Design a protein around this ligand. Sequence first.
Ligand SMILES: OC[C@H]1N/C(=N\O)[C@H](O)[C@@H](O)[C@@H]1O
Ligand SMILES: [Zn+2]
Length: 1016
Amino acid sequence: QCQDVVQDVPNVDVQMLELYDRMSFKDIDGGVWKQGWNIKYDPLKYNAHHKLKVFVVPHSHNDPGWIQTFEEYYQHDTKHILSNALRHLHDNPEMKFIWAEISYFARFYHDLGENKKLQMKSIVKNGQLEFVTGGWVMPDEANSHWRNVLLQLTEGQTWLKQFMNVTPTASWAIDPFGHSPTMPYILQKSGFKNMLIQRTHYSVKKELAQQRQLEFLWRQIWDNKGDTALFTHMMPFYSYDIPHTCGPDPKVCCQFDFKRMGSFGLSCPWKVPPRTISDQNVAARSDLLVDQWKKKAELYRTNVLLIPLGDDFRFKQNTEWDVQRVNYERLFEHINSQAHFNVQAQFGTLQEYFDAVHQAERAGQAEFPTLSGDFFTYADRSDNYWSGYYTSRPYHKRMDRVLMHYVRAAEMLSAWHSWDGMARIEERLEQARRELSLFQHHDGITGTAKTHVVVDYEQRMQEALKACQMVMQQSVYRLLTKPSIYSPDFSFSYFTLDDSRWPGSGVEDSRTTIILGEDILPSKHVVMHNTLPHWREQLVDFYVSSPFVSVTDLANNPVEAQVSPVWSWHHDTLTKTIHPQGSTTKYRIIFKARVPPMGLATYVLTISDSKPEHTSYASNLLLRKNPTSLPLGQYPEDVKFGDPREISLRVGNGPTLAFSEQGLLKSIQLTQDSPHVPVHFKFLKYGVRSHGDRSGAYLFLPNGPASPVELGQPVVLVTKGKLESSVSVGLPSVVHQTIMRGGAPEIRNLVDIGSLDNTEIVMRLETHIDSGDIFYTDLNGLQFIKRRRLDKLPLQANYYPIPSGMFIEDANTRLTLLTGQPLGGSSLASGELEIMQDRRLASDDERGLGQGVLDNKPVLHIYRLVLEKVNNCVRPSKLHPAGYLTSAAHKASQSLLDPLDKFIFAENEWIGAQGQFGGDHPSAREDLDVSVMRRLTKSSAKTQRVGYVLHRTNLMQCGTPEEHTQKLDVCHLLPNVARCERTTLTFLQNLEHLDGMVAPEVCPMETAAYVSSHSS
Ligand SMILES: OC[C@H]1N/C(=N\O)[C@H](O)[C@@H](O)[C@@H]1O
Ligand SMILES: [Zn+2]
């Protein structure tokens, strides 16, 4: 029934890994088309019975923040563009315009009076103004998680359906810096039929152009059948601006950008200005233009040609609308009337272009090639590879993943009930979804905006996190309070969230201490939420005011706990060391929480006068020369000291880890009987070129391979406990921690690059895995793609996005590094993995930002490190372009991206408290996730509707016998179901009415959406 995504290598015309292996990448001067060749065409190709149909598509690229904030651009530019578009399109029925960024459109439309709204709806309904993609933004494709790509698409398309009564089926992505197959994956499952991309490596444009493979059916790398395919048009030239969209010669094309004649402060750098079209010059000008068009048409298979007409924040001034429209109308009138050209040219929209292309295809005029793979890493020229932005502004990249999870948890927790309008749940969820969606912009999460714009995005995300916490905590109070006692005030804070890893220790002291005492408050309720649809255990930690605390569940069963000190690291300018200080006023308590699928579990923390029976205390060892005491307030175990030395640790039955005298992992032993496998962490630094092009927010242009960070004699802190042990070391710019809880370790790096200008800090893992030139990285948290290090490409070209994980393997051993934040990384030699931590760059990199990256702030990066024997696993063949995680690595990724949420009850007594919610929820197979649960209706709706997005990943079979699991039917999660429908992933179109109101589970690597309707 399901396609096998492991064992069948798809047969495609172009497979991007294979193409890379064969391509030359030489950067030769191609003439006027600098990165191509001098295109030749047969004038006799087009004739009376076979004309070239040309669609000139006006557009305006509007960045939702970049060098100005969203609101600054809206006020200065976009409100004028949209206001003038409305007027000019209304007045000029043949003029056309496409619009991509619904965040700006919604911002505009809600300032419009009813008359103008009506006018706007009319120009949409008549096809003059066409929305393309219809997402809130045009998202980055490298760093974004697929869940947030879907979130932002749904936010914009839901707005469009509600207010404009349209749903785009053509996508326009002219600016993300490289392109991912996650986009056609999501688009094709959201009703799309066509997409367009632009920023692909110049060598790839030349290669595909030569073969007329710029239009292709883009399928997923594992897709044998081709049911994922989406028609894709890649534009052939260096930019989406007018000089690079009319044809191969920008000196000619620039003369047809009528905004460049002087009064607009634009000119043509090729030194020939546009000239106003007149009767005396129209034949000559038409000749030049048609020649460019016919050359462009040579690169494509049909007689239908797409000519975008636009640039950044274009179509602003009334005079600009006039100058472009009138001059092009004069060219069209001449060209279309002169038979010798055999051209019919008109303003069009993107959908009109694709419709005409497919008519030609249906007429047998063309067949299109099939393609799989991705389009990373982009270079726009020479060796300028855009791998810098995989890491730029990493604090905000990590914040993206935190907010991603909190949006999911807030929508899920609140979905279980209908809420009175006074609760403001819808309002707060809309704000949170919109701020996270905005950040998916290709100058948001990418870290390529001006400093003040990064600040605006951070403030917006901070407000979104507060909104999520508010919704979550009201939801928990309702889900766990006896209904006849439940007495909400929708403004009150019943719980506060406690998050151990954001912003993180040494980033912000934001964590509340639970204050208990015999004379004040003996105990405190805490509640964990588990957004995943299976039972889950995870260690959780809280700060408490006494070491003498015991844990119980709400049946009053003792729960084993471990108390540890609260350690913070400080740069001691007196001693010039980085060393830990122990709190004397608070302590950490850790215990295993067990939480139902998509559910809640309540525990109680109680103080006592002496060591509790079921609470243990960690030992602590500080390794350094010249130690000084470390008192720990009331903590019962004395800190030990020693000179630096190698150490080994083992928690539970888990691996045994060995560390160097500098506190860095050196080996992992999986079992008592097994070998100590070399796995060495190392920190290195890249610099910047003194001569030649400089690294900046976009570009990574290292001055050679990385050099090891000089570590000196760092202070190492070892904490050894029954439930959790750790080794932490204060290195220059990084406090590096390895945490062991009895499985794959967790790594945390508190990265503070300080004032180290022109430095990029990298964390490398060195092993003996015989990986050669192969490694695997993920795309948007959705899939893992095989990469091959190519020595024909420079180091920065071998860097790829690491949005959630990467791995190397040989026949017997795999090492997988999972990340809690998108960063850039590579495997630059056999057996190595490396991932960039932060970068601080003093120069601009000539891509328009006009600043370096000098606004770094401490960030806590999190990882899981999974070493596994893989000789028994059924893996794809050598020729397959995908790889797949094991169960342990997938669960490890889930532990980083969707951890248990922790709530602390905010007052002394919670009357009517309950022990659990969701005990009856089905515990689904481990590869299945409920990516989204969202109530789609407000409380006054007679028929309530709840939408679910189900994703099943594909995990490697390695001989672990599959256990019993329960079928998950999302349509029966809420009572009184009246209908279950399969829908597009945006929930906007019903695709199947489901028998028995049962939502089937999905196939490996597939994602489906369902909407259940309930009588209320
Ligand atoms: O050079 C790339 C840069 N330049 C742009 N226009 O000049 C893009 O709109 C912006 O999103 C991008 O970051
Ligand atoms: Zn842009």
